[PDB]
Amino acid sequence: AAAIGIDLGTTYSCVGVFQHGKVEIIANDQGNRTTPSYVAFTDTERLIGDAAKNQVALNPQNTVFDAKRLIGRKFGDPVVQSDMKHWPFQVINDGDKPKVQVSYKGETKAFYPEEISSMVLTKMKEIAEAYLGYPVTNAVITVPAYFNDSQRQATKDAGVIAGLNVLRIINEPTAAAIAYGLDRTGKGERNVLIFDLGGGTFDVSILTIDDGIFEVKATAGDTHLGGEDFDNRLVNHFVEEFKRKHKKDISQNKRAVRRLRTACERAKRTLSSSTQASLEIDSLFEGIDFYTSITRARFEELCSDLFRSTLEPVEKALRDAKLDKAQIHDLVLVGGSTRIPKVQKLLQDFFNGRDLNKSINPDEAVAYGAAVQAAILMG
Numbered sequence: 001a002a003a004i005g006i007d008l009g010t011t012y013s014c015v016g017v018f019q020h021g022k023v024e025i026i027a028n029d030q031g032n033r034t035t036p037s038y039v040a041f042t043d044t045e046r047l048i049g050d051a052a053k054n055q056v057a058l059n060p061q062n063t064v065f066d067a068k069r070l071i072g073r074k075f076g077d078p079v080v081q082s083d084m085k086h087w088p089f090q091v092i093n094d095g096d097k098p099k100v101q102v103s104y105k106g107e108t109k110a111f112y113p114e115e116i117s118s119m120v121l122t123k124m125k126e127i128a129e130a131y132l133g134y135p136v137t138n139a140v141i142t143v144p145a146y147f148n149d150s151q152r153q154a155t156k157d158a159g160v161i162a163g164l165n166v167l168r169i170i171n172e173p174t175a176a177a178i179a180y181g182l183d184r185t186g187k188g189e190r191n192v193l194i195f196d197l198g199g200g201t202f203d204v205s206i207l208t209i210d211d212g213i214f215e216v217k218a219t220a221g222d223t224h225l226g227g228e229d230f231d232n233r234l235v236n237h238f239v240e241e242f243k244r245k246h247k248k249d250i251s252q253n254k255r256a257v258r259r260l261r262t263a264c265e266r267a268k269r270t271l272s273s274s275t276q277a278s279l280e281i282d283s284l285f286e287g288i289d290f291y292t293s294i295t296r297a298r299f300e301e302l303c304s305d306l307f308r309s310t311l312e313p314v315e316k317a318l319r320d321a322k323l324d325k326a327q328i329h330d331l332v333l334v335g336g337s338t339r340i341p342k343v344q345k346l347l348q349d350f351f352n353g354r355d356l357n358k359s360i361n362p363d364e365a366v367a368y369g370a371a372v373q374a375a376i377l378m379g
C-alpha cells in the first residue's frame, strides 16, 4: 500500500507514486498531469480543480484560489492585506487568522486556508486512490524553501484534514533535486541551482549536497512573478487590440477580461511549441467575436522585462551562496513557465551555453521527488 508524493502548488498541484522502481505521475479525470489549485462553491455543489477553474468567469465571489498565499499567516500580515485587494472572493478576520467566505448551497460559509488546501489535497488523494485501487493514508507534501514554521504547520494540518498522515513536509527545491537523483551521488560535494518559475511565484534555490545530505545556501525570488503575470501582458495587448479593432473598452467587464485571461493562458502554452498561436473567442463583449493571433517573438517582447528580471535573483543567490556561475554542477529547471523557450534561452546565455536538465517535465518535478522520498520513508 504505497505512499503518495504531492506538490501542493500555489497555482497547480500534482500527485505521484513510486511503483516498481519508477515514478508514476497520475493524470486527473480530464487527463491532465496537473490540477489547478481552485475550489468553487455553487448553489448545488463544491468543485475542485479543472471543473472549478472552468466556471470561474461566471462565479467570481465563490471561486477560491491562491489559498497558499494565506496559509499559516495572520490576517493583519501586510502580505495578506495587500493580496486581498487582488481577489474577488472575500477574506475575513477570525480571531487573528484569515478565512475565505463564500456562498455555498444557499448559505454563507467560511473556511481557513488549510481547509481550502485540504480540499485540493483530497482531490489529489482520490485521483491516486482510483489509480492504485486502494485507500491512500500516507503522503509527503512539498512547500517552498522560504516557508516559516507556521506555514509548514498549517500545510501539514491541511494534510491531516484530508485524512492523510503526512510523513514529512519537504522543501520544493529539495524534492526537485531528489527527482534528478542528486542525493544518490555518494562521497562527493555537488552544487545545485533550482530555477523555479511557476504560475504565481519565482524561486531560485542553491543547494549543497554532501554524502546525500542537503544544505540550503541561498534562496531568492519573487513571490509575485510567474506565468499568470505573462498571461496578464497578453490580456492587456489584446484589450488594446480590441479598443482599436472594434472601438470598445472591455477592461471594465469582469467576465470578458476573465475569459480572455483564460484564452491567453492557452495561447501562451501553444507559443512554447509553435512560433504563433490563434485566439478564438465566440461572443467576448456585447455579442462581438474576437478572432486574432500573435507570434512568439511578439509575446517575448510583451514580456521582455519580466523574463530578464528572472536573472537578478540568480545573481543574488550566487553572491549570497558565495559561488560563481561556473561552480554550479547541475542546473535544474522546475515549474511550468520554464517551458517557455525565451526563458530557457536567457538562462543558457547567462550560464555560458550550458546544457540544461529538463528530462523531467518541470511542472511534475516536485511531485516526482516527493513520490520517491515518500516511498523511501515507507521502507
Ligand SMILES: Nc1ncnc2c1ncn2[C@@H]1O[C@H](COP(=O)(O)OP(=O)(O)O)[C@@H](O)[C@H]1O
Residues within 6 Å of the ligand: 009, 010, 011, 012, 013, 034, 197, 198, 199, 200, 201, 226, 227, 228, 265, 268, 269, 270, 272, 334, 335, 336, 337, 338, 339, 340, 362, 363
Ligand atoms: N507549455 C507551457 N508553456 C508556458 N507556460 C506553461 C506551459 N505549461 C504550463 N505553463 C504555465 O506554468 C504555470 C503552472 O506552473 P506549475 O509549476 O505547474 O504550478 P505552480 O507554479 O503553481 O507550482 C502556469 O502559469 C501555466 O500557464
Ligand SMILES: [Mg+2]
Residues within 6 Å of the ligand: 009, 010, 198, 335, 366
Ligand atoms: Mg510549483
Ligand code: NA
Residues within 6 Å of the ligand: 007, 008, 009, 010, 011, 012, 013, 014, 198, 363
Ligand atoms: Na505546482
Ligand code: NA
Residues within 6 Å of the ligand: 196, 197, 198, 199, 200, 201, 202, 203, 335
Ligand atoms: Na514556483
Ligand code: NA
Residues within 6 Å of the ligand: 010, 011, 197, 198, 199, 200, 201, 202, 226
Ligand atoms: Na507558483
